Amino acid sequence: GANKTVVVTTILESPYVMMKKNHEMLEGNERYEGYCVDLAAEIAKHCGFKYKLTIVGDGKYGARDADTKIWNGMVGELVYGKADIAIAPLTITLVREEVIDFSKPFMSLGISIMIKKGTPIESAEDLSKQTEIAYGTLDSGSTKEFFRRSKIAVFDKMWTYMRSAEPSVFVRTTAEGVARVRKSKGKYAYLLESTMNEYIEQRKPCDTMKVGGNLDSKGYGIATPKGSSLGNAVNLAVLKLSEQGLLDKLKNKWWYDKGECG
Amino acid sequence: KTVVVTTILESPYVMMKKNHEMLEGNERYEGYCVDLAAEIAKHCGFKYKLTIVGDGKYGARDADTKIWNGMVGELVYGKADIAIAPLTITLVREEVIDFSKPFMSLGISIMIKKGTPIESAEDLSKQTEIAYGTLDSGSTKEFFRRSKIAVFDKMWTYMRSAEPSVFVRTTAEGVARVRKSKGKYAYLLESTMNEYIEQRKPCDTMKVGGNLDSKGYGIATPKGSSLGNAVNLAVLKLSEQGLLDKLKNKWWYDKGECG
Ligand SMILES: CN1CNS(=O)(=O)c2ccc(CCc3ccc4c(c3)N(C)CNS4(=O)=O)cc21
Ligand SMILES: N[C@@H](CCC(=O)O)C(=O)O
Ligand SMILES: N[C@@H](CCC(=O)O)C(=O)O
Ligand SMILES: [Cl-]
Ligand SMILES: [Cl-]
Ligand SMILES: [Cl-]
Ligand SMILES: [Cl-]
């Protein structure tokens, strides 16, 4: 049939998607800026489709409710046919690949530790062997699922603590985790993806630090519903952009060219 | 039916065992990709036969005949059912074969003999005393041939016409050239292999500078293969169980010989 506008689900997560200065004077895709906004435009141009960016209603990446088995977040938008494609920092995972399709990765990441500068923590093993400093993860994402499912001794011990900690150590948004690090005087550490950690480290007031090596090695992919006709073209577009160096330029544009800490 | 796996002799991915001459079949070989093959086959439930690619090449398309060689060619023309090897995901290959999600990350990197006054690709491009080249018939050479980045295009212009040839047929030949050229040759190769060799005797090479790109290895199948889906889910399963990280530590850090 005739060409229709592709519905893109994404999420407000800096620097992937951010509200522009004066967004209240703008409409449609012009309201937004960031790495994934630029990436959407490049993918759409190579694949030759028009699109509308839509922020996921519940603000979640995507997890499956154990009881109802209903998917939420951006994953749910694809599963239930409310969006045609997700262009966001959406981590490739086994459970998600069982229900949606992912392109080859457009960016690498691993789980990492964010501390307030001066916190006497250097590693996940350090976190697991003490109780003075609390720590947690984002809700409804791949990081929380990583710890829930891990059989590695240190990570299993961390999950056993996190799942029962009171008050809750989990946060609903990355911004809430950053605020908790900054306001807890070194008594909270935040487990998040190295990409977001490195971005925040270069934003004012320059009071956080990434410590230790990454806990795993993964990537973000552009997601489509299973059997989608867009998957093949999107996949080739990602690989083309990668080999031309454009994904590297976009990373430098939105992370380091924008750095505020020197 | 028994799955024919094409792979390539490349340390520490696939290596001949000690006393291999008295062994038979898959037992002749050891390494990261040998272990990975066993894990994939177990999760997907197939029997397999490891076969070293006849021409010893990863895979490139002949510009004139448009015939693919190497492991890529084995898949395209039906001589193998799957490739389990350090085979780089690239656009040109994705147009003719299928790749799993990546099982290992890498980037192009620089290998020097210790003490060579080179710190970056920009350093190499701005001088002529130190020659440099890449492996033939692989993704690294193709990267430089197709690049429009100023530094890498300048490097390609030099490499393509240098005499004697700066390209080598095997990784081992590139390393030997670094070690024997008294600092007058630097070798462009993937960071995974660079880091492995750096920790092998005689401990006389060094990786310098950041990686020039960011990519990964994938398990490859012919287009439309019924094995593609299961293999992909198996890789992701192994990744999340931490088994790919275990395998890396087994074949890289456990084999380090330089302290
Ligand atoms: C950025 N980029 C460009 N496109 S690409 O050539 O396909 C490509 C392949 C691999 C990586 C390395 C990072 C990564 C991403 C994704 C996964 C990983 C590891 N591992 C190691 C486990 N499997 S995965 O799919 O979660 C990056 C990459
Ligand atoms: N990238 C993650 C969200 C962030 C996190 O879980 O740390 C996901 O796709 O679920
Ligand atoms: N991994 C490369 C071979 C090594 C190289 O080109 O440096 C390939 O798949 O072609
Ligand atoms: Cl429309
Ligand atoms: Cl058979
Ligand atoms: Cl022997
Ligand atoms: Cl040949």
UniProtKB/Swiss-Prot annotation, chain B:
At the top level of its lineage, which domain of life is listed? Eukaryota
Query: What other remark does the UniProt record contain for this protein?
Result: The postsynaptic actions of L-glutamate are mediated by a variety of receptors that are named according to their selective agonists. This receptor binds AMPA (quisqualate) > L-glutamate > kainate.
Question: According to the record, which residues of the full protein are present here?
Answer: 414 to 795 of 883
**What protein am I looking at?**
Glutamate receptor 2
What does the entry say induces or represses the expression of this protein?
Answer: Down-regulated in the pyramidal cell layer of CA1 in the hippocampus by global ischemia.
The lineage, from the top, is:
Eukaryota, Metazoa, Chordata, Craniata, Vertebrata
What information about domains appears in the record's comments?
The M4 transmembrane segment mediates tetramerization and is required for cell surface expression.
Chain positions of site Crucial to convey clamshell closure to channel opening: I118
User: How is the quaternary structure described?
Assistant: Homotetramer or heterotetramer of pore-forming glutamate receptor subunits. Tetramers may be formed by the dimerization of dimers. May interact with MPP4. Forms a ternary complex with GRIP1 and CSPG4. Interacts with ATAD1 in an ATP-dependent manner. ATAD1-catalyzed ATP hydrolysis disrupts binding to ATAD1 and to GRIP1 and leads to AMPAR complex disassembly. Interacts with GRIP2. Interacts with GRIP1. Interacts with NSF via its C-terminus. Interacts with CACNG2, PICK1 and GRIP2. Interacts with GRIA1 and SYNDIG1. Part of a complex containing GRIA2, NSF and NAPA and/or NAPB.
